[PDB]
Every structure is written in structure tokens, then in C-alpha cells.
Enzyme design. Structure first.
Site, short mmCIF file in Angstrom:
data_model
loop_
_atom_site.label_atom_id
_atom_site.label_comp_id
_atom_site.label_asym_id
_atom_site.label_seq_id
_atom_site.Cartn_x
_atom_site.Cartn_y
_atom_site.Cartn_z
CG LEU A 233 9.48 7.43 11.35
CD1 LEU A 233 9.04 6.40 10.33
CD2 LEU A 233 10.91 7.87 11.04
CB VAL B 32 5.13 2.62 -2.96
CG1 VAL B 32 6.50 3.06 -3.45
CG2 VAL B 32 4.99 1.10 -3.05
CB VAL B 33 4.75 0.41 2.40
CG1 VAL B 33 5.46 -0.48 3.42
CG2 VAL B 33 4.69 1.85 2.93
CG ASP C 183 0.10 10.57 14.04
OD1 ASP C 183 -1.06 10.47 14.50
OD2 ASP C 183 0.32 10.71 12.82
N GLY D 25 0.80 -1.22 0.00
CA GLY D 25 0.00 0.00 0.00
C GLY D 25 0.83 1.26 0.00
CD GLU E 93 8.57 -7.05 14.44
OE1 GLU E 93 7.96 -7.96 15.02
OE2 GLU E 93 8.92 -6.00 15.01
CE1 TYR E 94 4.04 -8.06 5.47
CE2 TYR E 94 4.14 -10.33 6.26
CZ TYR E 94 3.52 -9.33 5.51
OH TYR E 94 2.36 -9.61 4.81
CG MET E 95 4.12 -5.48 11.95
SD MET E 95 4.60 -6.43 13.41
CE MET E 95 3.19 -6.14 14.47
N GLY F 78 1.48 5.11 2.09
CA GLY F 78 1.32 5.95 3.27
C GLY F 78 1.84 7.36 3.02
C1 LIG Z 1 2.97 1.30 7.80
C2 LIG Z 1 2.41 1.09 6.40
C3 LIG Z 1 1.92 2.20 5.69
N1 LIG Z 1 1.96 3.46 6.30
C4 LIG Z 1 3.07 4.25 6.33
O1 LIG Z 1 4.11 3.91 5.80
C5 LIG Z 1 3.02 5.54 7.06
C6 LIG Z 1 1.99 5.78 7.99
C7 LIG Z 1 1.93 6.97 8.69
C8 LIG Z 1 2.92 7.95 8.52
N2 LIG Z 1 2.85 9.16 9.23
C9 LIG Z 1 4.14 9.90 9.31
C10 LIG Z 1 5.04 9.47 10.48
C11 LIG Z 1 4.28 9.44 11.81
C12 LIG Z 1 3.07 8.52 11.67
C13 LIG Z 1 2.16 9.06 10.54
C14 LIG Z 1 3.95 7.70 7.60
C15 LIG Z 1 4.01 6.52 6.88
C16 LIG Z 1 1.38 2.03 4.41
C17 LIG Z 1 1.35 0.77 3.84
C18 LIG Z 1 1.83 -0.33 4.53
C19 LIG Z 1 2.37 -0.20 5.82
C20 LIG Z 1 2.87 -1.45 6.49
C21 LIG Z 1 4.02 -1.43 7.23
N3 LIG Z 1 4.50 -2.56 7.84
C22 LIG Z 1 5.72 -2.50 8.65
C23 LIG Z 1 3.82 -3.73 7.68
O2 LIG Z 1 4.19 -4.77 8.19
C24 LIG Z 1 2.59 -3.73 6.87
N4 LIG Z 1 1.94 -4.96 6.73
C25 LIG Z 1 0.76 -5.26 6.05
C26 LIG Z 1 0.35 -6.59 6.02
C27 LIG Z 1 -0.81 -6.96 5.36
C28 LIG Z 1 -1.60 -5.99 4.73
C29 LIG Z 1 -2.84 -6.37 4.02
O3 LIG Z 1 -2.89 -6.20 2.81
N5 LIG Z 1 -3.92 -6.92 4.64
C30 LIG Z 1 -5.14 -7.29 3.88
C31 LIG Z 1 -5.47 -8.77 4.17
N6 LIG Z 1 -5.60 -8.99 5.62
C32 LIG Z 1 -5.80 -10.44 5.81
C33 LIG Z 1 -4.34 -8.66 6.30
C34 LIG Z 1 -3.98 -7.18 6.10
C35 LIG Z 1 -1.18 -4.65 4.75
C36 LIG Z 1 -0.02 -4.29 5.40
N7 LIG Z 1 2.19 -2.60 6.32
#
Ligand SMILES: Cc1c(NC(=O)c2ccc(N3CCCCC3)cc2)cccc1-c1cn(C)c(=O)c(Nc2ccc(C(=O)N3CCN(C)CC3)cc2)n1
Length: 263
Positions: A147, A20-21, A126, A14, A80-82, A16
């Protein structure tokens, strides 16, 4: 400094605030998430210097920073991956049909991470369900602590901006730009409310403007149905008008454990 040769990009997770991440593998073995920092979105040089401090922040309930790729543009942030993604979306899926004990455990996970950060005198700024992640074991961890300081988007960093966390902010933040451990405490109380209301938007019937007016008048969020008197007392204690009357994360953790034992 991670060598980009050691990274394999596999899928997009996705977008943020920094762009892109992606999901990938580190050294052909370890699951990672990788922020690809969109040029113009971050104060990169400042981040790069702080990266060391943030890499020293290691706690079971914090999303672990593994390293950075900075000898290139765009830069990478490897963590780390979540597997189960964002806590907010997680909360809004009715299928999980959470017991309240599971809800309190989410609260405790976050409280543990925040206590660590507090002991390190490190502010999140935040804290909200959207900025917590859920791993494969249902464990909640706090993401992107600190961040906020490197975001260049004025809509985010300005109190009157459309992206500012108004509904998670104490009166002194909105009126005076008074940031402290106690402003993180406030936001934590709102996070507890998010968890117990299963992902409702705080002050769901108000605008950001009306919310600021509401909390200035000494009025607060109502008790979520699923929260007991004791649980409500905890979150409410986070919202005292005087900042120094609000608990520490250590006290909150003690209160949460009490409720666990009692109820
Ligand atoms: C974290 C994250 C973002 N968002 C950002 O990057 C971002 C957010 C705020 C921000 N601000 C500025 C700094 C202060 C805070 C506010 C800056 C950047 C966007 C996309 C993915 C992840 C992500 C990350 N990590 C470390 C993960 O591990 C992860 N894992 C995912 C795992 C599964 C899914 C998923 O597609 N689903 C759908 C199906 N479900 C079964 C499970 C979840 C999505 C993400 N997503």
C-alpha cells in the site's frame, strides 16, 4: 466489491496515513476493520486496479483483505480484524512479560508471511513492527503490504522526508533508491531487533541522518540482551553490505526453526 449495506460501523480504532480506521461488523456476523480513505491521501484509481491482485494474496500470516467499497467517496478498505492492535505497542507493554520463545514465534509468524510474499514476487516496502498486527490468539500478521505505493504524502515517500522509514532501510535504498526482495530482508532483520529489544526505536541514540551515515560505514545495530548468539546471527545476516549476500525468507525461516529446535 462489498456492498456498504452489509457494513455496520461500531467503534473508532484510530487514525493512520489514510485517515480514520473503524471496527465494525460484516453481514451482521464477522468482525472487520474498515479504513475510511481520507480524500487526498491516496492514489485511489491506482489502488482500485491493484486491489484484485492484493485480494488474491491469501496467507494465514497476512492481514486478509476482505473487499473494497469503491462506488462511493470516501472509499472503504475492509480487512480482517486484529483485536490486540499494533505489534509495536504490544511489544512496549511490560505486562506481557514475554518469554524469548514467544518473541521468536513473532519473528516466525512474520517470516512466514514474508516468504509467501517473496514467492509471489510482491514487496512490502515498509516492514516494521508498527505495520504488523496482533490478533486475539497472539498471532502476528503483516499489515498494509504494497500500500506504500499509493501514499501521496511527500514526507513519507521521499528518502529525505520526515516520515520515510530510514531506520528500516538498507544503504542502497537510501543512497540509490534500489528496492528489491533484499530491501525487505534488511527491514525484517530490523523488525527482529525491534521484537528482541521489546519495541525500542532502532538506533535510538541517533537521528535519521546519523543512522544513514552509520550503516554506510558498515556499522550495525548491537545485539539485544534477549537475543542469543544464534538469533543475532540471523538478524545480522539480513544486513550484509552486498544485497545478494543477504538470505531469502525461505532460508531465514529455516534458520528460525533451527534455533527453536536448538535453544
Ligand atoms: C492499521 C491501522 C491503522 N493504520 C493504518 O491504517 C495505516 C498504517 C500505515 C500506513 N502506511 C501506508 C501504507 C504502507 C504502510 C504505511 C497506512 C495506513 C490505524 C488505526 C487502526 C489500524 C488497525 C487496523 N486493523 C486491521 C486492525 O485490526 C486494528 N485493530 C486494533 C485493535 C485494537 C486496538 C486498540 O485500541 N488497543 C488498545 C487496547 N489493547 C488491549 C488492544 C489494542 C487498536 C487497533 N487496527
Amino acid at each position: 466489491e462489498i456492498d456498504p449495506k452489509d457494513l455496520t460501523f461500531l467503534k473508532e480504532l484510530g487514525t493512520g496515513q489514510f485517515g480514520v480506521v473503524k471496527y465494525g461488523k460484516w453481514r451482521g456476523q464477522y468482525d472487520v476493520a474498515i479504513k475510511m480513505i481520507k480524500e487526498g491521501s491516496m492514489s485511489e484509481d491506482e489502488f482500485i486496479e491493484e486491489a484484485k491482485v492484493m485480494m488474491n494474496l491469501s496467507h494465514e500470516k497476512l492481514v486478509q483483505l476482505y473487499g473494497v467499497c469503491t462506488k462511493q467517496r470516501p472509499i472503504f478498505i475492509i480487512t480482517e480484524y486484529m483485536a490486540n492492535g499494533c505489534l509495536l505497542n504490544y511489544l512496549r507493554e511490560a505486562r506481557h512479560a514475554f518469554q524469548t520463545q514467544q518473541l521468536l514465534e513473532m519473528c516466525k509468524d512474520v517470516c512466514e508471511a514474508m516468504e509467501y510474499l517473496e514467492s509471489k514476487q510482491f514487496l512490502h516496502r515498509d516492514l516494521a513492527a508498527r505495520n504488523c498486527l496482533v490478533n486475539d490468539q497472539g498471532v502476528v500478521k503483516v499489515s498494509d503490504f504494497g500500500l506504500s505505493r499509493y501514499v501521496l504524502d511527500d514526507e513519507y515517500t521521499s528518502s529525505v522526508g520526515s516520515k520515510f522509514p530510514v531506520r528500516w532501510s538498507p544503504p542502497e535504498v537510501l543512497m540509490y533508491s534500489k528496492f528489491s526482495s533484499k530491501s525487505d530482508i534488511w527491514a525484517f532483520g530490523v523488525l527482529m531487533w525491534e521484537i528482541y529489544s521489546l519495541g525500542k526505536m532502532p538506533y535510538e541514540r541517533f537521528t535519521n541522518s546519523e543512522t544513514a551515515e552509520h550503516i554506510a560505514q558498515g556499522l550495525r545495530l548491537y545485539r539485544p540482551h534477549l537475543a542469543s548468539a544464534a538469533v543475532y546471527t540471523i538478524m545480522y545476516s539480513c544486513w550484509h553490505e552486498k544485497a545478494d549476500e543477504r538470505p531469502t525468507f525461505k532460508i531465514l525461516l529455516s534458520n528460525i526453526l533451527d534455533v527453536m529446535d536448538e535453544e
